[PDB]
Amino acid sequence: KVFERCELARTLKRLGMDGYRGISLANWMCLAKWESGYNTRATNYNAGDRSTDYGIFQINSRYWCNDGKTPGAVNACHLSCSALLQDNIADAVACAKRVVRDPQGIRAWGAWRNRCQNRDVRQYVQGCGV
C-alpha cells in the first residue's frame, strides 16, 4: 500500500503515534516519507551486512524482525518481517514503538537524523486534521 499523506497521518494518530515517547506525528510522517515514500511494501537489502529493511518505516532484520535469512539477527519486535509488509500498519507501528523505547529514540533511523532532525516538519501534517 502506498499511503497518501493525510490518510497516513490519521492512521498513525489513530494508532497512538502522536507524542509516543515524546515523538510528534510530524516526525513519524517525515520518517515514513524519507524511508519509503509511505510504501508498506518497500524493501531494501543491505549487501554490506546481509540484513534487509522492511515496510513503511524500513525496519531492519538484524535487530527488530525475523526473516530467517539474516546472520546472527535477533527479533526485538517479536514479529515476522512479513508482518511489516502488510497494508495494515498496526504491526509496523507496534514495532516502530518498540524501536523508540530504546535509548536513541527516533534517532535509531539514520534517515530521520539526516532529513527530519532540527528541521521544520510541520508541512507533513498540515491540513490533515491531526
Side-chain angles (χ1 to χ4, degrees):
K1 180 172 180 176
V2 174
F3 281 79
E4 294 210 271
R5 189 179 63 93
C6 292
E7 187 213 328
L8 177 61
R10 291 188 294 267
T11 304
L12 293 173
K13 191 178 190 172
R14 215 143 43 210
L15 287 159
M17 291 289 263
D18 200 357
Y20 185 80
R21 294 284 149 121
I23 301 159
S24 70
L25 186 57
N27 277 295
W28 291 119
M29 289 295 292
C30 181
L31 175 70
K33 169 79 171 186
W34 287 113
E35 287 293 351
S36 68
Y38 310 144
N39 183 6
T40 63
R41 289 183 58 255
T43 62
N44 170 70
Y45 179 62
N46 298 305
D49 77 321
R50 298 184 173 201
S51 68
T52 304
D53 299 329
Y54 296 88
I56 192 173
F57 293 128
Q58 287 291 276
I59 289 166
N60 192 255
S61 61
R62 183 151 293 296
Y63 327 87
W64 316 104
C65 65
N66 181 48
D67 64 358
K69 62 177 174 196
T70 309
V74 292
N75 179 13
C77 296
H78 290 99
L79 290 171
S80 164
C81 292
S82 174
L84 308 182
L85 302 176
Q86 293 178 86
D87 278 5
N88 180 291
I89 66 173
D91 287 331
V93 163
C95 188
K97 292 181 173 182
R98 171 64 186 81
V99 180
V100 303
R101 287 201 292 278
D102 275 9
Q104 280 183 305
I106 190 75
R107 283 159 167 80
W109 287 272
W112 180 85
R113 296 192 209 168
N114 304 359
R115 320 206 152 229
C116 307
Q117 176 178 189
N118 303 150
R119 310 256 199 170
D120 183 347
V121 295
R122 295 174 306 135
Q123 68 185 304
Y124 298 104
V125 299
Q126 300 307 274
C128 307
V130 297

mmCIF file of all heavy atoms in Angstrom, residues 1 4 8-9 13 15-20 31-32 39-40 44 47 56 79 83 88-89 94 98-99 116 118 128 130:
data_model
loop_
_atom_site.group_PDB
_atom_site.id
_atom_site.type_symbol
_atom_site.label_atom_id
_atom_site.label_comp_id
_atom_site.label_asym_id
_atom_site.label_seq_id
_atom_site.Cartn_x
_atom_site.Cartn_y
_atom_site.Cartn_z
ATOM 1 N N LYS A 1 0.849 -1.212 0.000
ATOM 2 C CA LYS A 1 0.000 0.000 0.000
ATOM 3 C C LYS A 1 0.877 1.252 0.000
ATOM 4 O O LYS A 1 1.871 1.324 0.731
ATOM 5 C CB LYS A 1 -0.887 0.027 1.259
ATOM 6 C CG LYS A 1 -1.799 1.236 1.334
ATOM 7 C CD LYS A 1 -2.787 1.129 2.472
ATOM 8 C CE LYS A 1 -3.686 2.366 2.520
ATOM 9 N NZ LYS A 1 -4.731 2.231 3.591
ATOM 10 N N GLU A 4 -1.483 7.958 1.098
ATOM 11 C CA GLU A 4 -1.493 9.349 0.707
ATOM 12 C C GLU A 4 -1.110 10.010 2.039
ATOM 13 O O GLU A 4 -1.347 9.428 3.099
ATOM 14 C CB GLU A 4 -2.877 9.777 0.240
ATOM 15 C CG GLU A 4 -3.284 9.060 -1.041
ATOM 16 C CD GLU A 4 -4.210 9.878 -1.914
ATOM 17 O OE1 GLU A 4 -5.449 9.791 -1.735
ATOM 18 O OE2 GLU A 4 -3.689 10.603 -2.793
ATOM 19 N N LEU A 8 -2.310 8.780 5.916
ATOM 20 C CA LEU A 8 -1.364 8.144 6.823
ATOM 21 C C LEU A 8 -1.310 8.860 8.187
ATOM 22 O O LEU A 8 -1.317 8.204 9.231
ATOM 23 C CB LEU A 8 0.039 8.080 6.196
ATOM 24 C CG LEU A 8 1.176 7.502 7.054
ATOM 25 C CD1 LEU A 8 0.878 6.081 7.422
ATOM 26 C CD2 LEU A 8 2.494 7.587 6.314
ATOM 27 N N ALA A 9 -1.286 10.192 8.181
ATOM 28 C CA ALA A 9 -1.218 10.948 9.444
ATOM 29 C C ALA A 9 -2.299 10.497 10.412
ATOM 30 O O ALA A 9 -2.019 10.196 11.577
ATOM 31 C CB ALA A 9 -1.322 12.451 9.184
ATOM 32 N N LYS A 13 -2.041 8.531 13.876
ATOM 33 C CA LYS A 13 -2.646 9.149 15.038
ATOM 34 C C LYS A 13 -3.629 8.188 15.712
ATOM 35 O O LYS A 13 -3.604 8.017 16.938
ATOM 36 C CB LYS A 13 -3.342 10.459 14.666
ATOM 37 C CG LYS A 13 -3.734 11.229 15.906
ATOM 38 C CD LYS A 13 -4.392 12.548 15.638
ATOM 39 C CE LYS A 13 -4.498 13.282 16.974
ATOM 40 N NZ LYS A 13 -4.962 14.667 16.821
ATOM 41 N N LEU A 15 -3.538 5.093 15.677
ATOM 42 C CA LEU A 15 -2.762 4.001 16.268
ATOM 43 C C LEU A 15 -1.905 4.415 17.460
ATOM 44 O O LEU A 15 -1.064 3.641 17.924
ATOM 45 C CB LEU A 15 -1.890 3.332 15.201
ATOM 46 C CG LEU A 15 -2.614 2.455 14.173
ATOM 47 C CD1 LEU A 15 -1.758 2.291 12.911
ATOM 48 C CD2 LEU A 15 -2.961 1.105 14.800
ATOM 49 N N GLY A 16 -2.099 5.641 17.931
ATOM 50 C CA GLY A 16 -1.372 6.109 19.089
ATOM 51 C C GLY A 16 0.041 6.621 18.897
ATOM 52 O O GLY A 16 0.793 6.681 19.864
ATOM 53 N N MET A 17 0.395 7.061 17.697
ATOM 54 C CA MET A 17 1.758 7.544 17.460
ATOM 55 C C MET A 17 2.059 9.003 17.827
ATOM 56 O O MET A 17 3.217 9.347 18.052
ATOM 57 C CB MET A 17 2.146 7.297 16.009
ATOM 58 C CG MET A 17 2.307 5.829 15.706
ATOM 59 S SD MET A 17 3.776 5.191 16.499
ATOM 60 C CE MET A 17 4.900 5.292 15.083
ATOM 61 N N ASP A 18 1.026 9.841 17.909
ATOM 62 C CA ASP A 18 1.201 11.265 18.209
ATOM 63 C C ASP A 18 1.725 11.464 19.630
ATOM 64 O O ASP A 18 0.982 11.289 20.603
ATOM 65 C CB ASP A 18 -0.122 12.023 18.030
ATOM 66 C CG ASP A 18 0.077 13.526 17.852
ATOM 67 O OD1 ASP A 18 1.234 14.008 17.914
ATOM 68 O OD2 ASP A 18 -0.933 14.237 17.642
ATOM 69 N N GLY A 19 3.012 11.803 19.735
ATOM 70 C CA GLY A 19 3.643 12.017 21.034
ATOM 71 C C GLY A 19 4.123 10.761 21.741
ATOM 72 O O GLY A 19 4.486 10.813 22.922
ATOM 73 N N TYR A 20 4.119 9.622 21.055
ATOM 74 C CA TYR A 20 4.575 8.385 21.675
ATOM 75 C C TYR A 20 6.035 8.630 22.045
ATOM 76 O O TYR A 20 6.834 9.014 21.182
ATOM 77 C CB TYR A 20 4.456 7.197 20.706
ATOM 78 C CG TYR A 20 4.809 5.882 21.357
ATOM 79 C CD1 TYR A 20 3.885 5.217 22.166
ATOM 80 C CD2 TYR A 20 6.107 5.349 21.253
ATOM 81 C CE1 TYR A 20 4.245 4.063 22.873
ATOM 82 C CE2 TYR A 20 6.479 4.192 21.951
ATOM 83 C CZ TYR A 20 5.543 3.560 22.764
ATOM 84 O OH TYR A 20 5.900 2.453 23.487
ATOM 85 N N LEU A 31 9.666 10.602 8.857
ATOM 86 C CA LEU A 31 10.403 9.347 8.834
ATOM 87 C C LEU A 31 9.858 8.410 7.747
ATOM 88 O O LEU A 31 10.612 7.916 6.895
ATOM 89 C CB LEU A 31 10.347 8.650 10.196
ATOM 90 C CG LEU A 31 10.984 7.252 10.276
ATOM 91 C CD1 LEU A 31 12.507 7.371 10.154
ATOM 92 C CD2 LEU A 31 10.569 6.525 11.563
ATOM 93 N N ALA A 32 8.550 8.174 7.778
ATOM 94 C CA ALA A 32 7.892 7.309 6.802
ATOM 95 C C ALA A 32 8.094 7.825 5.388
ATOM 96 O O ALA A 32 8.258 7.039 4.446
ATOM 97 C CB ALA A 32 6.385 7.177 7.119
ATOM 98 N N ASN A 39 5.329 3.786 1.608
ATOM 99 C CA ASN A 39 5.109 2.476 0.981
ATOM 100 C C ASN A 39 5.331 1.328 1.957
ATOM 101 O O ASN A 39 6.471 1.052 2.373
ATOM 102 C CB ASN A 39 6.053 2.336 -0.228
ATOM 103 C CG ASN A 39 5.862 1.042 -0.996
ATOM 104 O OD1 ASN A 39 4.955 0.254 -0.719
ATOM 105 N ND2 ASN A 39 6.737 0.807 -1.964
ATOM 106 N N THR A 40 4.251 0.610 2.263
ATOM 107 C CA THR A 40 4.293 -0.529 3.174
ATOM 108 C C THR A 40 4.997 -1.774 2.587
ATOM 109 O O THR A 40 5.380 -2.678 3.333
ATOM 110 C CB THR A 40 2.856 -0.942 3.635
ATOM 111 O OG1 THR A 40 2.086 -1.363 2.498
ATOM 112 C CG2 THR A 40 2.137 0.249 4.297
ATOM 113 N N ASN A 44 14.572 -3.167 1.218
ATOM 114 C CA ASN A 44 15.911 -2.776 0.830
ATOM 115 C C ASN A 44 16.914 -3.730 1.442
ATOM 116 O O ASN A 44 17.023 -3.822 2.661
ATOM 117 C CB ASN A 44 16.181 -1.347 1.296
ATOM 118 C CG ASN A 44 17.622 -0.955 1.156
ATOM 119 O OD1 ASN A 44 18.121 -0.789 0.047
ATOM 120 N ND2 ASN A 44 18.311 -0.816 2.280
ATOM 121 N N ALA A 47 23.531 -5.327 1.300
ATOM 122 C CA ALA A 47 24.576 -6.303 0.948
ATOM 123 C C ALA A 47 25.776 -6.266 1.878
ATOM 124 O O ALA A 47 26.452 -7.284 2.088
ATOM 125 C CB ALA A 47 25.024 -6.102 -0.483
ATOM 126 N N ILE A 56 7.031 0.404 5.624
ATOM 127 C CA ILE A 56 6.897 1.843 5.579
ATOM 128 C C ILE A 56 7.948 2.596 6.419
ATOM 129 O O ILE A 56 8.356 3.710 6.069
ATOM 130 C CB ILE A 56 5.428 2.248 5.889
ATOM 131 C CG1 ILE A 56 5.188 3.720 5.550
ATOM 132 C CG2 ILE A 56 5.052 1.899 7.330
ATOM 133 C CD1 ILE A 56 3.716 4.143 5.661
ATOM 134 N N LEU A 79 8.215 -10.299 15.710
ATOM 135 C CA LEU A 79 7.338 -10.330 14.535
ATOM 136 C C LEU A 79 8.101 -10.886 13.350
ATOM 137 O O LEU A 79 9.324 -10.784 13.276
ATOM 138 C CB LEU A 79 6.895 -8.914 14.127
ATOM 139 C CG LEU A 79 5.922 -8.043 14.919
ATOM 140 C CD1 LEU A 79 5.915 -6.657 14.317
ATOM 141 C CD2 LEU A 79 4.529 -8.640 14.904
ATOM 142 N N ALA A 83 5.244 -9.387 8.561
ATOM 143 C CA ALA A 83 4.234 -8.556 9.222
ATOM 144 C C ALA A 83 4.403 -7.075 8.887
ATOM 145 O O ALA A 83 3.431 -6.313 8.899
ATOM 146 C CB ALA A 83 4.278 -8.776 10.734
ATOM 147 N N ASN A 88 -2.060 -3.025 6.276
ATOM 148 C CA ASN A 88 -2.434 -2.593 7.617
ATOM 149 C C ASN A 88 -1.123 -2.393 8.386
ATOM 150 O O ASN A 88 -0.378 -3.342 8.616
ATOM 151 C CB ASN A 88 -3.280 -3.664 8.301
ATOM 152 C CG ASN A 88 -3.707 -3.265 9.702
ATOM 153 O OD1 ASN A 88 -2.884 -3.186 10.613
ATOM 154 N ND2 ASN A 88 -4.989 -2.993 9.875
ATOM 155 N N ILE A 89 -0.865 -1.160 8.802
ATOM 156 C CA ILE A 89 0.370 -0.825 9.501
ATOM 157 C C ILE A 89 0.409 -0.995 11.020
ATOM 158 O O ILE A 89 1.399 -0.643 11.655
ATOM 159 C CB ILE A 89 0.839 0.601 9.106
ATOM 160 C CG1 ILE A 89 -0.153 1.663 9.598
ATOM 161 C CG2 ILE A 89 0.999 0.692 7.599
ATOM 162 C CD1 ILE A 89 0.334 3.109 9.392
ATOM 163 N N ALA A 94 3.571 -1.060 15.968
ATOM 164 C CA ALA A 94 3.911 -1.706 17.236
ATOM 165 C C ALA A 94 5.430 -1.869 17.318
ATOM 166 O O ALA A 94 6.044 -1.675 18.370
ATOM 167 C CB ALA A 94 3.235 -3.065 17.320
ATOM 168 N N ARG A 98 8.360 -0.012 19.588
ATOM 169 C CA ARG A 98 9.370 -0.808 20.277
ATOM 170 C C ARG A 98 10.766 -0.242 20.027
ATOM 171 O O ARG A 98 11.577 -0.184 20.947
ATOM 172 C CB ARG A 98 9.309 -2.280 19.828
ATOM 173 C CG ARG A 98 10.464 -3.162 20.317
ATOM 174 C CD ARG A 98 10.511 -3.319 21.839
ATOM 175 N NE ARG A 98 11.710 -4.039 22.279
ATOM 176 C CZ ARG A 98 12.916 -3.496 22.431
ATOM 177 N NH1 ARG A 98 13.122 -2.200 22.201
ATOM 178 N NH2 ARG A 98 13.928 -4.253 22.837
ATOM 179 N N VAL A 99 11.050 0.173 18.798
ATOM 180 C CA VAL A 99 12.370 0.725 18.454
ATOM 181 C C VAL A 99 12.713 1.956 19.316
ATOM 182 O O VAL A 99 13.798 2.036 19.910
ATOM 183 C CB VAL A 99 12.452 1.118 16.956
ATOM 184 C CG1 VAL A 99 13.851 1.696 16.619
ATOM 185 C CG2 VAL A 99 12.135 -0.090 16.080
ATOM 186 N N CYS A 116 15.077 14.916 8.972
ATOM 187 C CA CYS A 116 13.984 15.362 9.842
ATOM 188 C C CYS A 116 14.456 16.116 11.085
ATOM 189 O O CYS A 116 13.809 17.068 11.511
ATOM 190 C CB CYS A 116 13.143 14.172 10.285
ATOM 191 S SG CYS A 116 12.543 13.157 8.894
ATOM 192 N N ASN A 118 16.054 18.626 13.569
ATOM 193 C CA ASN A 118 16.343 20.058 13.503
ATOM 194 C C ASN A 118 15.782 20.709 12.247
ATOM 195 O O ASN A 118 16.301 21.732 11.776
ATOM 196 C CB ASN A 118 17.857 20.332 13.576
ATOM 197 C CG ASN A 118 18.512 19.767 14.820
ATOM 198 O OD1 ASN A 118 19.690 19.402 14.784
ATOM 199 N ND2 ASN A 118 17.781 19.713 15.928
ATOM 200 N N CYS A 128 -4.208 17.934 7.639
ATOM 201 C CA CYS A 128 -4.656 16.554 7.812
ATOM 202 C C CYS A 128 -5.673 16.332 8.926
ATOM 203 O O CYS A 128 -6.217 15.230 9.079
ATOM 204 C CB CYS A 128 -3.462 15.620 8.012
ATOM 205 S SG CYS A 128 -2.184 15.740 6.718
ATOM 206 N N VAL A 130 -5.062 16.524 12.164
ATOM 207 C CA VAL A 130 -4.453 15.793 13.261
ATOM 208 C C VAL A 130 -3.790 16.747 14.241
ATOM 209 O O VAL A 130 -3.822 17.960 13.973
ATOM 210 C CB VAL A 130 -3.426 14.765 12.745
ATOM 211 C CG1 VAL A 130 -4.126 13.728 11.887
ATOM 212 C CG2 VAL A 130 -2.336 15.463 11.944
#
